[PDB]
Symmetry: D2
Subunit: 489 residues, 4 copies
């Protein structure tokens, strides 16, 4: 039996674009993503699945049912996000005393007049519907973490198609400092209007995936899909700043804690002779972002600076984890090997014989322990495992995946890491971005035809860990690798 502190909470994570739409009159066509996925050229090139969000789970209308099932499993923490385009679907007045040609955004003026002025533009319905939803959530008794940004930018801030075509004379999302300015004002307004329901705050969700897949990994089908290393750094630089600003904006209206949710991977060395490759990958992929928003360390050009306007802008770290990444040195370089981690064949086995999910990701619970202890030992900020799950509609690997990973959180905790919760990537099946509805990550299966939810056996396993605050003795065998034998290779 593996016990967790009385204060450790078990729950789920969810996003607006992925789960909200589905119920009639729940559509939101005002985001760069809704557009990106309906684009005829994007569909013909096969960049997007062809699946439309409009036919999702239905969390905008069926949220009671979602929370009912969440209560039954005995979950005590939820992390949702507000959709920016629902509040402000129309352009806001250009914010005076703001020079777009200014590279840095060392500050933003947020005061009650400002908020009061933003209220004139905000969409009262969207605002009221959300309040109802977070209200219902709070009544059930769940701790609530609120995420400000989970990918989609409103169209007036980013037309993904124009940028894809190479046209930079339009709303260009994270490439423009305008977006940075408005994000900070948005953060504060929302904090300002929901602080009575929120418990902890998250500025954005996996900012690194937005900058990375949108401008470098163009085959993933993420917007704007314009390949450029340079522009990728521009967006990342703007994202870091948009965080510091949002952090300060929320503080201006609240004392609640504020952190960020980041996409992680455990970098494992292909050979003992690959230790340095690991260190280099973690820098390039993890440390540079957090040293920026924590130690305030960053570098324009190659000029390592230290902007005190960035220094100390994080309260907690959200840890997202799915699988590992195997790297190998290259004189000075390092590389990411295929046949391991995220680059595996679907429903088969990795080059190491570990099974792989419906998305082609390799089973590797051990990597969570590595990620949690590295963050803990380097920054000592408490953390939540804000995402962890597996695409597996049949539910063959999920029971083992769930118990094995919850086991590693427990293991990190005993090594001294302050981890306060485990939030499974998803309660129910949702829309997987470029992949569509085909990748099912939920503890509950969704009949997209009737919007009805079903309990997959692993939901009943989760109810035992949650309802017990521990990996009980009777399910302790699931803390193992799913038998590859009966599964495909």
């Amino acid at each position: 039996m593996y016990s967790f502190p009385n204060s450790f909470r078990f729950g789920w994570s969810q996003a607006g674009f992925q789960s909200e739409m589905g119920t009639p009159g729940s559509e939101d066509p005002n985001t760069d993503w809704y557009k990106w996925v309906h684009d005829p050229e994007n569909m013909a090139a096969g960049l997007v699945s062809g699946d439309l969000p409009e036919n999702g789970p239905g969390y905008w209308g069926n949220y009671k049912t979602f929370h009912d099932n969440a209560q039954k499993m005995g979950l005590k923490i939820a992390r949702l996000n507000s959709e920016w385009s629902r509040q402000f679907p129309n352009p806001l007045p250009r914010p005076q005393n703001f020079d777009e040609s200014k590279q840095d955004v060392t500050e933003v003026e947020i005061n009650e007049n400002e908020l009061k002025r933003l209220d004139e533009y905000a969409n009262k319905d969207a605002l009221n519907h959300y309040r109802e939803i977070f209200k219902d959530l709070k009544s059930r008794g769940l701790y609530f973490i609120q995420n400000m940004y989970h990918w989609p930018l409103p169209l007036w801030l980013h037309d993904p198609i124009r940028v894809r075509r190479g046209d930079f004379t339009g709303p260009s999302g994270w490439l423009s400092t305008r977006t940075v300015y408005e994000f900070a004002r948005f953060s504060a307004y929302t904090a300002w209007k929901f602080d009575d329901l929120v418990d902890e705050y998250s500025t954005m969700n996996e900012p690194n995936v937005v900058g990375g897949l949108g401008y470098v990994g163009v085959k993933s089908g993420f917007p704007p899909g314009y390949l450029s290393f340079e522009l990728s750094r521009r967006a990342m630089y703007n994202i870091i700043q948009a965080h510091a600003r949002a952090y300060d904006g929320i503080k201006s209206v609240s004392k609640k804690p504020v952190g960020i949710i980041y996409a992680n991977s455990s970098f494992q060395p292909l050979t003992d002779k690959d230790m340095e490759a690991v260190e280099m990958a973690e820098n390039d992929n993890r440390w540079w972002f957090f040293d920026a928003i924590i130690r305030g360390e960053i570098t324009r050009g190659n000029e390592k600076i230290v902007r005190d306007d960035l220094k100390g802008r994080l309260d907690w770290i959200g840890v997202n984890y799915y699988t590992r990444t195997v790297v190998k040195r290259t004189e000075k370089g390092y590389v990411s090997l295929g046949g391991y981690g995220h680059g595996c064949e679907r429903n088969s086995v990795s080059l190491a014989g570990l099974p792989t999910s419906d998305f082609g990701w390799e089973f590797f619970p051990e990597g969570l322990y590595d990620v949690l202890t590295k963050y803990w030992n380097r920054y000592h900020l408490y953390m939540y495992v804000t995402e962890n799950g597996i695409a597996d509609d049949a539910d063959y690997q999920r029971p083992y995946y769930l118990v094995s990973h919850v086991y590693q959180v427990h293991r990190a905790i005993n090594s001294g890491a302050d981890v306060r919760g485990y939030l499974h990537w998803s309660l129910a099946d949702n829309y997987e971005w470029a992949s569509g509805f085909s990748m099912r990550f939920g503890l509950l299966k969704v009949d997209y035809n009737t919007k009805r939810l079903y309990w997959r056996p692993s939901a009943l396993v989760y109810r035992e860990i949650a309802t017990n605050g521990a990996i009980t003795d009777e399910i302790e065998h699931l803390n193992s690798v799913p038998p590859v034998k009966p599964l495909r290779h």
Copy 2:
């Protein structure tokens, strides 16, 4: 949601040889089976796995734990059997007024003196330990069906090795009418001593597998493994008679109902042009046995008789079901096709694309409905589904197998069949005869090393059906074929 009558009960089945041994001092080396499996020649020929029962689950010593877990799932019916060799491990006095050379056993004298005399020979410990066990079971609140015979005969009644070598001058199990005589006396004695704990009675378990695999299907590794069509009929004839006699013996001491548990398969025609092949297979394999012990119809030679000493000797029918059998006509014949039913490759897919278990049996829930309605419409005796399960250690197919089959019982019931219970083949993993411990059929996994039990996710699914007396709405999707895609082919 599929509801079952308030009186329908959910539980499990188990056998003595398969689950009892394991706890120190629980050994029983006095059966033809314990011997058959320790034989050096049998092991070298690969007829038996090499796995020894002595290292089983431990139900002789850990039965409280088994019943505890059984209570937690909300099971309300159990069907165990007493081991003949535990009561009478030593020979009994030849029963006077009994001519071995007599083909038929139209009767056996059982009266209180007789029983009282048998008590002089019975093993008081074995007798007391069993009483304790069935007591503990009964306290928990479970209905109890008791099976008199579940394969092993005591050595003094059958030396399997001598017969395997072709030596018929020794104790020869079902080939000798002596065995028939003693079985009837054994039945009555046990009924006589346990009638206060028993609820319903079963004479024997799958008598057809004993006669069939022991003398025709010699590759299965069942004793005595002497190939002969003729001797196979001799044993079957003696088994039918041993039932009628046991039935009468139990009646002599009790009013409780008495039925038999039989191994079934749903005979499906390979082509529409194969209907007659099905009818012929059901006769040859099902109807001839039950017409015998019910309508009293049988045939010595080819001489269709009607022994009133057999007529009407059944109260209820136990239905065991695992998979199907595909047959095809042959001018006058019919055949059993491979690549379907029981003759499939392990963890692969049948010739029809249906997944197969760790034993190579094909998924076919529909066959249960066929078996239940055919028995019901032909004999109208109420029934229990006394066995149904799947060898599946990983637990990939079990959730679907369980819910899909329970669904067909519900379906048979609504067609008018009086079915009063569903007993899953096994609570925990046990010893699978010639196959050893390798074929895991339990809702609970057993660490044979520590005798510790674990809940497989399907146990938690069963607890929902049992605890609810219905296939609740949230698990109603399991009533489907496991996705073959992620599984091996």
Copy 3:
């Protein structure tokens, strides 16, 4: 035994970019492709394998060996192409009396002065080395078809990176009419200098793949990778014209026949209710291009015209064939289903149970017969099966693939189609564009490390068909589907 006419010839096809480089001093860095594949951004996005052509087979230096092995198999026809960038690696003088802003290119002036002037710019070495190569080929006794264009454009005519970034102020390949003008002059110059060695002429290789994958199917990794339906039509329009012009240019200097090599697929209807979908797909994908360069029919805007400068510009049709495409209607639309044809999982089985190659293409010999008879019945131009093969390094499916397809050519011939040769896609392993060296299509395996060639068993099977001018009786069983059973699913 299946016999072919005495005049039917058996051989192979090969391309310059794919097979030439490999031998020291054989590099050609002056093409849009050599650049596209060395681009650091393209590699990081995973658009190109990371494999470089510089390390190919070595046909520039080891061509004797290639022809030796070709003789041994008894092949009598070869179809190679000249690399444009090898002749004219430097820009040519803008051709006066030519207005780039002119949409149509109804003509090009080619006369002996012109040719004589081009000779001043041509790379004498490249020119001499090629002559040596085609000489050696011709001595062995092989009929020689010569292809003018097999994808790469010289850098001075197309910078793929600039266009990928959305910059259209540079050399833009098929988007500029300049390219059309120069292609026609190039065709004539080459015809003019090699007509003594050539037997038949081909203007370009699969023009439809260039226009299609380069501007619509952007995930394939073909240059320039700029997604635009409109630009795709522009390039296709320019390609059709560049053909007519090249056709006329070659005629100006030679009487030899001139055709085009096109990429094909057999459109099969998913259901009987899908016949119209097939017809629509063949139009959209086959007929519109050939009606253009044959009946002279085309349409600017939606304005169906008939440019007599295009009318009748084809002598023969090269048929390339690999697999099928399954389509399904959509009210007015039609769609391409995945799990069939080219969109199958690698080394597995299609949705129809047909095996798939190392590239994920489905086995479907029957489609060749369909393609050959449809072209024959619609245009009655004789044809060659200029490409047909399979990525299969192990050589498991090749023997069956080869014999089954050669069998369908024979079948088309007997239905009355004038087909004069079968050219297997490749003698040896070569560079598969965006896929790298990993997709091995050769009858001969190449150790890229030593440039050494090896005979795969299917080479010895081909030597029997070629050396015999027929599918001999002893290998006639290969005319079947490879057994899926032993292969992966």
Copy 4:
């Protein structure tokens, strides 16, 4: 390129029961095997496939065709056997001066009168037909090894059914010394009548499989299928003696060499800590038989004797090899692991990742080198690799299997072993005993429906090695493990 001596010959092996029948009027129902396989009980128990030899290849009538195809591949050695039951289908007069109760057969009187007397009983037709066949073979120019015994005993010497039932009062094959006596007389008669056509002599084929599978490994379905360790030793003892006697009988009439063909396996240790297990397995399985017929060493009881009537009765050793056997120590014991060697799953992969054939045997060329060098270093008798092949109808693994094994012969030769030929197990598909026609081991595929032969690509590979006396450079890559990737697991 791997060259073989000019005197090394390449050919095939074949057996009478397996290949002869098929052509009308070629039936031979007078063997224990023909009976064993038609037995209704044996078929119902699934001990025999249900496939009947009567429908085999047809080598009794189509032998010209077989030799034609054999010539074309350039084979120069053949090893066939005469069917005992064809010569003497009726009982011979009990041979006077012969006491059945005599354990040892230290001698047999063979002289010209005897032979002349046997000629009175011999079947002239069978005798003439064989002569024609070996004549035709010899004309083509092939060296001919002749095997006296390749399993079937005539019915008058063995009724397998009676023994299976445990009845030892009848003709009991190798259990009776009568069989030993008659075998020696049979050997001499045949040598006496064919010595003009024969080149070298073999007494029997894999005697160890007859004794082993017939009396211990009873699941294989070999006659008589009576499980007994003791009787297994009796038959082995009688087989050794029947060899010495046959050896002497042949010498009495010929100077040609005489050896024996034995079934081999390379014993590999599971762990370095398993060396002794290997040594023990080779003794138990290889050395005890050859020390007997060579050093004359044997042991009745446990009494190690040295019968000079056995001493030195071997001229050459026939080496049969298919796969390996992995063993592991057991205090004093050793064991044969499953998932390796012969005990692997069909068309899958062994526990070591090596592919497996249609029979479930693991790819392990290296074992041939081990077997050849161990025999050479211990007895220094020259040898032939009389059998080596793979069940593989599709022909996926055969090309690699063939070249890899021929490569190891070459390797043994260079280590100093006198190996004079490689005879592939089979030219064409034949009847695989208990397995039926389903296991196809031929270089040529047989359409059992028309008796027509087809060349599998590996036949064309063999023609290159044979026709060249070497592994030419162009096919030298086949000396590797078939790629498991595209194959099933």
